[PDB]
Amino acid sequence: VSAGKGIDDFNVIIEIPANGGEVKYEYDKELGFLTVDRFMPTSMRYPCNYGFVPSTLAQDGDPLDVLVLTPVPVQPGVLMRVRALGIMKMEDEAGEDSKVLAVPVVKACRAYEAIQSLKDISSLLLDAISHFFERYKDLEPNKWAKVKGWEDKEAAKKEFEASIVRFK
Amino acid sequence: LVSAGKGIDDFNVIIEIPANGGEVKYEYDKELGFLTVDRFMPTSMRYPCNYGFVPSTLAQDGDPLDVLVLTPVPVQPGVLMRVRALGIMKMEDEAGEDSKVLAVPVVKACRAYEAIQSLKDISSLLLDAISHFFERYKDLEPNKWAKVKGWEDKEAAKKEFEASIVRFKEK
């Protein structure tokens, strides 16, 4: 699967739906199956859809992670075309592991057409997202996470581009 | 790789939208081998039944044959079913004519529907709700519109089905 055209139109395979999280799925490219990663014994729920960009490689060693805001949750395993608004910088027990924040391309979501950059997102929503990643590992032995903050679309673009070159 | 099936009485449909869904509209991409997001519908309308297509077919629309599938409960998108046609809904939108085959699961899959053999056996109010949905689900989309002409019997459905298999074969 291609990574997509670019930062304004790239592909994302959804692993976890908005409002999900009690079970964490991970896509297994080798087997071509959506797989169970872990059951999360906590009261936290994903504030948005969660997935990765195919044909990319982040420092983490996994494909680039993506957070996707949508009007309603998307079924895990589904592929969708999105555009970046910015990027969330964070680190966990493994190291640095930022997540791009995206919405669907205009062709797929007219309701979000007015949302063009990170500033068009309420700080409240960003706070809730940051809060989720700050705390969702609280009850997991040996696991932790710290959100450094948010950066703009250009930062997202750079990490996206660098992610393409790192792949192949 | 997936056959259209045996015939009008037992053919394959891949479900893209579950009954009562539509807020998010999925579409299967044969090239990628993934169910994909087509669009998010901003309208208050919801699909009145399951919606999908017959693999290995080609309608006059240039897209695989559309199929509405009535079932006791909604089916998960991305799932393949065996169905049988009861008839076909004729309509027209901005892109011209279009038709939707109306089907139910084969008897083996749904004994409860065995007595349903034709459009006559479907609640007139259900057929009306299906018509209304397609009449109305494009109301808020710019440069798009739709109009339902009427319903036609199983034989008409059979003709469109057979023809769509031919078009596919010749591609």
Added chain:
Amino acid sequence: LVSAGKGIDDFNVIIEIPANGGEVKYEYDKELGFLTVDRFMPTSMRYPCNYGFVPSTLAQDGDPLDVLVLTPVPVQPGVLMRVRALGIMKMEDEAGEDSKVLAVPVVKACRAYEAIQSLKDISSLLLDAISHFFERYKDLEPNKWAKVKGWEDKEAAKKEFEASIVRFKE
């Protein structure tokens, strides 16, 4: 395709029906690479746990080994997971012996079930509800029936497991 896993303590399962599902019975078609509708259940019942099969195995009924998977929340149909067996539900139906392994996610995947290590750690009522389900869910289907012999330990589960793999490899 997909291996069965390494052992009775750590093997692969593809989920076909989610816990609390069943109104539609799905089956995974390996030849087509699609989850398919098997049939719609006429009875007003629901699966008491997730239901699936072990890839690259072959039970006596001609299908891969059946597996019942207990999880904190239902798993989406079509998903592959890593599990470990607690025991096996011995049963026969209209097509012969078709026993089903009872499993839970491997520790790595479910810390909440770390303490569960045997059937005896499972609620007695739950096991009863599971037996009752398979005894009854085919009531309104002509010529279909089930008789559950009873539950047996992990060792019974292992032999059945390490026997279905032989049939498949042959």
Added chain:
Amino acid sequence: LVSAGKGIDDFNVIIEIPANGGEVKYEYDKELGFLTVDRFMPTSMRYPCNYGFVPSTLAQDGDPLDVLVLTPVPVQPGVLMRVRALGIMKMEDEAGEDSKVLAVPVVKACRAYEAIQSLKDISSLLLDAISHFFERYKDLEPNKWAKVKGWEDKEAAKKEFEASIVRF
């Protein structure tokens, strides 16, 4: 407090268990004016239709008349609705005879079921599913049994309804 309604073609039902429900059984406490928890049920059985009672009636078992209500979608427990009878399910359990009126919403409330005027209008397969539920849902409790004698017409339903209003 709350009347039984106008008649067999239009009477009141307080819903206690929604169609597809059953994992938790509610019952309405008239003395407190609250919907309460009755019991949680282990069985994998789910109610094949909505379940409730007619207020201001008295059945054999000392409780108000039981009603099964078929609707296009489940109804929230604790809600009051106006229904019309199609017939009556005759049955006996370990505590004696305890029939249940089968009903649908009045026409003004559900056009969809307008064509359903009597038991004959109900598929025998749905009746079997309902009968099966009440015969099996107490299986996990030995020495607790249930037997459905069969289904009787609207006139038999009307007799029991009026008889139960008498006792009250």
Added chain:
Amino acid sequence: LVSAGKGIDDFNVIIEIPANGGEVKYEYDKELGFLTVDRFMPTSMRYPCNYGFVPSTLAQDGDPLDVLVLTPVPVQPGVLMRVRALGIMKMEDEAGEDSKVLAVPVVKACRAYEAIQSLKDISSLLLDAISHFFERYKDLEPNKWAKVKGWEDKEAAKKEFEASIVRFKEK
């Protein structure tokens, strides 16, 4: 006896239908003290927001004043909440006037909507979806009719609110 509340910036609403619901429509019965079933909708549509009424008010149609309430997530039918008006949707049905106040929760209850103070703060796409719904939701119901005229401002909502209180008091 539940009062209408303090005023247009803080009044009471009893929710009857949750956002995204509607397949069953409920009505609160003050006389019986029960939420009741009004009707089942055949149309394949869902409410674009929560729907309820202001207690201790009387609209021209003999029922309490209708209110549409936008919230972050659906509210359970039968629940009371404190809201503030943004405007009013003018509409008529088969019998006559049946306008509906549009509201959001008071700031105390919903911080996230603090910046929303007038209709212009609501996306026109949502308002269009709401208007479309009320124009079309009776389409399949016999002897019913609806026509949405447009949106009016907070001052208009206030007028209607205060008058409907007057009517109630007048008996």
Added chain:
Amino acid sequence: VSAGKGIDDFNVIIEIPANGGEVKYEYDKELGFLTVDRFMPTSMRYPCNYGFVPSTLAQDGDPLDVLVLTPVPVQPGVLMRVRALGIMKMEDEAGEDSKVLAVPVVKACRAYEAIQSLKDISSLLLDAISHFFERYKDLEPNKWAKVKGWEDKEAAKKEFEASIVRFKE
């Protein structure tokens, strides 16, 4: 509505269902309605049903808070009979506001019949519960909570009885 019989069989009116919480309901005794308190900004859900014991009065000025563990979530606004397993001690912005932990009476839930004390509950569940009340007001200015710890049924009973007294005055 009375508080019920005692610590082993008392009445709870449910306000928030297990797995709910996005809308925080609160029962208004004056109006006789379940009402919206506020919408919760965090991406979290109650790890169990939440409610109160009628005809009680805790120190914060409200009826005694109760957490009820059930096999499935209970509809908000419903009354149920429960039995205490223990009590979660904690302070919030409004001061000491402990919450009794309970399960249904045996008649209502025979599956929980063997659960008689906190020891009988998964420690991971207790941790998920403590964590929830520690964090659920994170994005709420001037609201905060400190869980002191879990205490036994006798502790629960003492608080229960003390809340009865306060209500009676």
